[PDB]
Paper text:
Here, we reveal the extended and contracted atomic structures of an intact contractile-tailed phage (φCD508) that binds to and penetrates the protective S-layer of the Gram-positive human pathogen Clostridioides difficile. The virion can be divided into five distinct regions: the head, neck, tail, baseplate, and needle. Structures of purified φCD508 virions in both extended and contracted conformations were determined by single-particle EM of frozen-hydrated samples; the resolution ranged from 2.6 to 4.0 Å for the extended phage, and 2.9 to 4.2 Å for the contracted form.
The measured 20% reduction (48 nm) in tail length is consistent with a decrease in helical rise from 39 Å to 32 Å for 57 rings of sheath protein. In both the extended and the contracted form, the sheath ring retains integrity through its mesh network, similar to the sheath of other CISs. In helical reconstructions of the contracted tail, the tail tube cannot be resolved because of a mismatch between the helical parameters of the sheath and the tail tube. Furthermore, the X-loop blocks complete contraction of the tail for φCD508; we modeled the φCD508 sheath proteins into a more contracted conformation, based on pyocin trunk structures, but increased contraction of φCD508 sheath proteins led to steric clashes between the X-loop and the neighboring N-terminal linker, as well as domain II of a neighboring sheath.
Numbering used by the authors:
A (entry chain S): 13 to 472
B (entry chain M): 317 to 472
C (entry chain L): 13 to 79
Write the structure that this text describes.
Amino acid sequence: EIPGFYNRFKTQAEKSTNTGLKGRLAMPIRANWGDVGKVVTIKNDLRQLKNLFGDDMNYSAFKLGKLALLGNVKELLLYRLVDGNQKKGTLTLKDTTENSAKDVIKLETKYPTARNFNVTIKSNLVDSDKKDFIFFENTKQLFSSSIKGTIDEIVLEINSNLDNEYVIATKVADSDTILANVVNQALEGGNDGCTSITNESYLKALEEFERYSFDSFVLDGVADEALQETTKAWVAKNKELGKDILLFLGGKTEDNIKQINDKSKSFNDENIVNVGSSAYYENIKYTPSEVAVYIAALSVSKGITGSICNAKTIFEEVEPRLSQSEVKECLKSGTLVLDFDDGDVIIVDDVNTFKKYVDDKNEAMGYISNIMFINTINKDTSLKRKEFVGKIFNDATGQTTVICALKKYFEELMSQGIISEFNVDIDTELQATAKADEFYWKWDAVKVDVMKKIYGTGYL
Amino acid sequence: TGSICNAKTIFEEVEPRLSQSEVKECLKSGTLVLDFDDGDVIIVDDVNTFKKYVDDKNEAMGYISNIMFINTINKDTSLKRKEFVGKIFNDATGQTTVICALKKYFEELMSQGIISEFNVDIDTELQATAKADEFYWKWDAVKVDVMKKIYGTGYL
Amino acid sequence: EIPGFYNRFKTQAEKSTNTGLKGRLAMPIRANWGDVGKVVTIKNDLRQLKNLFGDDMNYSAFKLGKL
């Protein structure tokens, strides 16, 4: 640059930061409003969810999004599910100067929907040629504007202000004629999003979700069986492909605790978590899958350095309600069920559906926190792939560098206290059999536990 | 001193996109195809069209880096032609000088770590049959490999 | 395989082992329940015996198996 003393101030995020959030979650959702056919990330502010997908609790989108956000996920990734017939609302405007009136402007909702987004056009009381363009939803006004009677400036203004973000205006003809007055005319022709949604839509959503990486998946708070087996196979495929995705599920409200335990027996992969209990938060019930959304969100928000075995929930009630016998039955079945151990609703344990089996996949694998730990180690290691694969020569120096980097990572874990003991070394047994263009290595560790049970004995 | 089997590319998208079955099919066919192993576009492997065949032209010949190495050795050697052809007398001294120069070159390669092991010597089998105005020589080497595959096993 | 860094975790029997057992024994048995006409090996967990030959002490099978 030219000589001088040029300041560039950067008080962007000086101390406007907090560290109370973590994790990311996947969400196929049915929605009346918002983008369609894309996987969109949502920051934890619910205002973003409300803006980008509406505020209708009749739909899985807003309700499950609110539950996930209250789960304190750092970034919530959504995908709007639709049938192919799903459509945008639309309205058309016409001129009045000519006896044979001609359509000159068309209004269409910015996102596909079927809501009663309405529009009003009336004569401007100040200027003769101006028309006052006002927009509503069921007469609840969104935005008002006034432009002279030329179509180009009218559509440009209507598309300019983001107060009119609900609707897009397009020019039908290049007229300079006075528009026709409308009063609360709905943008018709749209279709909602709950229309004929089937397993194929969920399959397409999952195929879209293959692109990204996630900490957990919950399947739209829907307990349809065939979707559950499909997602089970999909997660197994993703695991075999090096994508370590965890899955939470919730049974149907009609299922008895015996049926829920049978389903939790049917699932035995460690990445499957079955939720049995229903709950109420704002005096409104939530099916086991709807609360499975929340428990998955809370789990991913916990991340490492935590668990869920007694994490307090937002729910004001829980049902069905279990004695210690029923709780033990559910845990032995691998079911996760909420509890009312105190005046609040409390998560009973960290169990997953796998826990029915014991020894080879160890008992700690029956707990979700260990699976999150293993998936995190696999993810960081598969991040190291690109640092080390195809970039170092397999000699003693390259092996030493790889081992030193992994040792530094595990020592960082040790510094956090997550691991009580570890060692990482070359797998000389397999390294002897290794081909010259490959490397084998081994590591042992001991994750630091957490009190689930405590016992006290008193003397007087 | 490098390869392409995981070199990051500048490309923001790649198509057509392949499962591991398709990738294995392409590699067995000798095809080179880009991949989206992460958020970027990444080169899958070092393979060439030859790789369909295996043993005589060895499996390392199926990889482009080995061919680049062999071509470089041939090029430097065919650079040495002008230094040695028609300029030294084929006696024991000339043969020793040629062998010493080639040994120095291969030791320079060893210093760079590209070669893990080598030996270079007169091809006494063909040198016995060699005409008086020519020279035969032999060399073995071991190019240093690179991790393409890595496997880890965990204990808790 | 294709190039990559593919983990395969093997926390099967990390430290879930003990050395308090040895030996093998033959047993012709009368039983109300279980397989017939085959020589079946039973691991020392009595639950395996109970599953594969019942839990009736009236028969040589369960009683002598427990012993």
